[PDB]
Amino acid sequence: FGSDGLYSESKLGLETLFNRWYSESWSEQLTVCGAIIGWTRGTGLMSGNNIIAEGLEKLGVRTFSQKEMAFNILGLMTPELTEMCQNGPVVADLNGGLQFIENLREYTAQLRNEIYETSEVRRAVSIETGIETRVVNGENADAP
Amino acid sequence: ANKPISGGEASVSSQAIAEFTHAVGNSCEDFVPRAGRPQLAPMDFAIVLGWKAIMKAIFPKTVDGDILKLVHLSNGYKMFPGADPLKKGDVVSTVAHIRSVVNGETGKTVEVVGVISRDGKPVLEVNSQFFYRGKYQDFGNSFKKTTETPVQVAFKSAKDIAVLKSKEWFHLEKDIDLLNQTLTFRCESYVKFKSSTVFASVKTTGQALLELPSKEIIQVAEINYESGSSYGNPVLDYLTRHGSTIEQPIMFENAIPLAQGTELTSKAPGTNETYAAVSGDYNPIHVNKVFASYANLPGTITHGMYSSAAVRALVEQWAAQNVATRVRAFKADFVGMVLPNDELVTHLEHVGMINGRKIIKVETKKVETEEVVLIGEAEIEQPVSTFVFTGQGSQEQGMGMDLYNSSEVAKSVWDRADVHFINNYGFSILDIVKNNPTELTVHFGGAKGRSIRNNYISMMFETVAADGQLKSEKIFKEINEDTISFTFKSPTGLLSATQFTQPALTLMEKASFEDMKSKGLVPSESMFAGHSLGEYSALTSLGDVMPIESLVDVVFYRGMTMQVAVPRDEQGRSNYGMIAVNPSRVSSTFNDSALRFVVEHIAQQTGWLLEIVNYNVENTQYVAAGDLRGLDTLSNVLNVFKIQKIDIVKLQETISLDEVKVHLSEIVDEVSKKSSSKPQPIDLERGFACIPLKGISVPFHSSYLRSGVKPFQTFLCKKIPKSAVKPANLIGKYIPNLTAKPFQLTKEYFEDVYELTKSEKIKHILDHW
Amino acid sequence: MRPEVEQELSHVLLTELLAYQFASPVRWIETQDVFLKDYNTERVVEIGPSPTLAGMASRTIKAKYESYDAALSLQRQVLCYAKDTKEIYYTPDPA
């Protein structure tokens, strides 16, 4: 996605723990259960990653709410899944099939500029059709 | 009142002119019948000729009111472009029509426009403005038709096109992307009135058009808004708050007073009976005291059109220098009346410019009660002008950069061509001008750098060898598909290189001209020429045949073919050069023919291609170019008979036998031998007449590179297309360097183009109708 | 000629007027005698960075047009864009 600082350099650096589990001495003190957190929608708030989630789900790809996504992580701590991590590290792709959209940066930015540009050409036209009705019918008759 | 009003056929006579100019005091030379030249008539004679048409407009039953309350508010004249004034034996016809019969809180205002037509073609129009006083409620007859101002609207976003397309009055004819482009609206209205603040039937019907980048305008749309019983104009309200008006007058930040140190007093006459006889305005509120007292006036007041015609003679005296053709339009508002025999002073001043014409503002007041009587302004043409454009050899590091930072229209031409230079050629021409470097490396790194390299491999030129023909080779032979960088080197700055000084000089002289033209400082009919490089800068600005992006293309290419046309040696030098000869610094009897014979003598004896390539000043400046050891004899033949001092034989006449072809033969031959003894990197040897032109290693404007014009012709034919040429911007005004006659389309002007070029492109049109 | 065939000849004249221009001598003596003494111009304006040929226009009117400018009593201006910018732009001093 880009323009995120060292966010992707610190999440990718955390993926050495699956190989450092074997090569080091902390196997019986720590168990690794890394989880790929998917496209989680926010709190229903005003976000650019919330407005395009509807058009992103038209491709057959699931986006998650924060209560569905928490149920996925809470299912990684069931006592049969805590036992799986003691035999070796466990990677859980909780990403909802979003890894099959290849042009994902350019497709999502196409969905932002689709939603934003019709927000302008409908607002400015509603403004200019409003102004045009007040020069023809006069400013005297706007009291309703 | 909507049909036009014919005013009949009227003539001009010498008895009508001379009685007119005496009645107003117009003692200009053009209106008095001298011997030799035809007599002219003033613009004020149009209200005499168009009196029967204009005054018939207030008369219909639909435009109602009494003439005894009628006020003449204003009256203006305007001459159509390209029109001569009225002659002595001129016969004219006039057509008038009414524009607006609007009502107000006081009575109604009638606007009448009448044009004068000489032999079918219109010469000038006159628009008046009358005012029936009273209280009127006839709104069924009230109308107003206009031609609205040329608003230009730009569309720099995709919502601006959608706002425009949502309007039902916008009929988009030719579907085209209007993003980052500008439309111009020529709209005209026709309004009926209902109660002086609401309308009855609005009809705005205009057009819209776009300038496409091959110097071409096309209609892209059509405005059609036919409403009724509305309150205002939404078409005009859209163009007001979105676009800006163009073709408007440009006012100075400080006006300048015109007749300084002179009081311009124009005291009203004793009677109004003489002006009423010379104009036909026989209404008795100016001559009869009974009618002037019945119509509630202070007295038998002076004609309003007298006051215009008498103050026009002061503009014709002080703004124009008593020449009538320079007065193109004059309007005046009759605010407050004058009685006969009262003193009044004017105040001429120059407040702005439009289309190269000067806007002189006048203001006439009475000297005693100090109330303003006449407010008007004129449209005095400038003196006849020529814009010459400088060639190469004069270039400074930082030229035009003070104008670049101050003017916004001189910045948008330097910027528009620098974007073209970076994206297509890999350097900045603003970087060259602001600090000329010794080196400049163009890099071909990325995907957009390998496309820049494709522009260097795809430019070709031609030359001849010792024997053979044209070759059609690459200019940059050292640029190929494995080349990652190319460097330009010049040991005396990069403004000294010809391929960088030519697109930097034509850009500055276009930036300089475009700043003047945006201020309204350039006349309509003005000649132009350029010396050696400026004739490309002349017709990109006054000719308007190529845009700024293709101008710098054909002139970077021009200085490139004028660089590889000479076979340079192991260094950057060669055997060809240039010298500047002065036939009166030395050898005080020489003329243009006494030195053209000498350079032809070394052109025939020992050959070597020595000729003169520009005749700048007669007997003062000739710059001749040739090869070294041929050009070195010229600076050591004419430069040696000021020391041993034989004056040449044509001091009075040649002797009756022909020794002049053979007595100066051995002196040019005894210097021809010692030129061969000099080393072939031949030095300059200025002498006393010749100035040693340094940096010019190519014989410009000779016939040595006659062979190279064939790739340069086919390059020009694809950057100056046929539709881009406007003939009226060149005919009779452009003066080339090839044929020093002005540009004309005549069958014997084409002869001199053939006997200088021998081109088959004009040969196969020379033999037709 | 017809107006739609005006610019056909005006194109093919102008390109050959430019193509052979740099391979033919510059006729600058014989064109200063066109915007002087054939079109009696009262102001010449040199658009350039330095007055090289605003200079040589004043040398021409001092050589063959001194009695001609006086007899017709016309006042010539040989203004250049580089240094005469006050009376090019009609912005004089407020005196």
Residue numbers in the entry:
A (entry chain A): 821 to 964
B (entry chain B): 1295 to 2063
C (entry chain A): 1 to 95
Provide excerpts from the study:
Unlike the dissociated systems of individual enzymes that make up type II FAS systems in plants and bacteria, Type I FAS systems in fungi and animals are large complexes that integrate the key enzymatic activities required for fatty acid biosynthesis. Along with structural support regions, enzymatic domains form the walls of the reaction chambers, with most active sites facing the chamber interior. The mobile acyl-carrier protein (ACP) domain tethers the growing fatty acid chain and carries it between active sites, so each can act on this in turn.
Here, we report the 3.1-Å resolution solution structure of P. pastoris FAS, determined by cryoEM. Density was present for most domains of the α- and β-subunits, including acetyl transferase (AT), ketoacyl reductase (KR), ketoacyl synthase (KS), enoylreductase (ER), dehydratase (DH) and malonyl/palmitoyl transferase (MPT) domains. The α subunit is mostly resolved, though several segments of the peptide sequence (including the ACP and PPT domains) are missing (residues 96–322, 535–598 and 1752–1879). The β subunit is practically complete, lacking only a small number of residues at the N- and C-termini (residues 1–9 and 2064–2069). We also observed density for a ligand bound within the active site of the ER domain (for reference), presumably a molecule of FMN. Here, the ferredoxin-like subdomain is positioned further away from the α/β-hydrolase fold in P. pastoris FAS, opening up a cleft between the two subdomains close to the active site. In particular, Q171 was shifted within the active site of the AT domain. H749 of the ER domain was also pointing in the opposite direction to the equivalent histidine in S. cerevisiae FAS.
